[PDB]
Write a protein that binds this ligand. Structure first.
Ligand SMILES: [Zn+2]
Length: 192
């Protein structure tokens, strides 16, 4: 029962956007258009923008979930390695084992699916400020190079728009690499 990563703009014209931050060594995180891939540092702000043509009704919710990009690992639940799971980095909201967190939103909700056992993080959809997009600050809490976790396996992040009853309103996804030097890693992967 692998989660769907099928792009779906829906009735509200939903798509994702990212800062055009470039690849200087100083960048905290940077998105590659060519690769549809976000490069970011562990536990650092990772802005992700929601763009809609029409405002979804309040009660709309925004869910993030990670899956493995390769089919051979797709049925395996992306979670934190034992080290980071036992790590003393709680924010008091997120479960220890969850890879993805939302920073700066006290209304954040976390889910361990009772059936799939997959982890996800969800927030109320808010329209853009009086701004053309809604920004959510995500934090990835394990490295792509973590021993015992992602284990250098590539992951996808799936962002889903859903109504208050859980019904699908839209979906987009991007690949994610959590690394020490996003700028350098992005530039290196785009070399070829
Ligand atoms: Zn880890």
């Amino acid at each position: 029962s692998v989660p769907s990563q099928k792009t779906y703009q829906g009735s509200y014209g939903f798509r994702l956007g990212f800062l055009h931050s470039g690849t200087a060594k100083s960048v905290t995180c940077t998105y590659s258009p060519a690769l549809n891939k976000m490069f970011c540092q562990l536990a650092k702000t990772c802005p992700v923008q929601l763009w809609v043509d029409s405002t979804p009704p309040p009660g709309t919710r925004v869910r993030a979930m990670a899956i493995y990009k390769q089919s051979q690992h797709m049925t395996e639940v992306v979670r934190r390695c034992p080290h980071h799971e036992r790590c003393s980095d709680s924010d008091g909201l997120a479960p220890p084992q969850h890879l993805i967190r939302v920073e700066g939103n006290l209304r954040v909700e976390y889910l361990d699916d009772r059936n799939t056992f997959r982890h996800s993080v969800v927030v109320p959809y808010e329209p853009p400020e009086v701004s053309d997009c809604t920004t959510i600050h995500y934090n990835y809490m394990c490295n792509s190079s973590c021993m015992g976790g992602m284990n250098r396996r590539p992951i996808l992040t799936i962002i889903t728009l859903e109504d208050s009853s859980g019904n699908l309103l839209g979906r987009n996804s991007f690949e994610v690499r959590v690394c020490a030097c996003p700028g350098r890693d992005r530039r290196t992967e785009e070399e070829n």
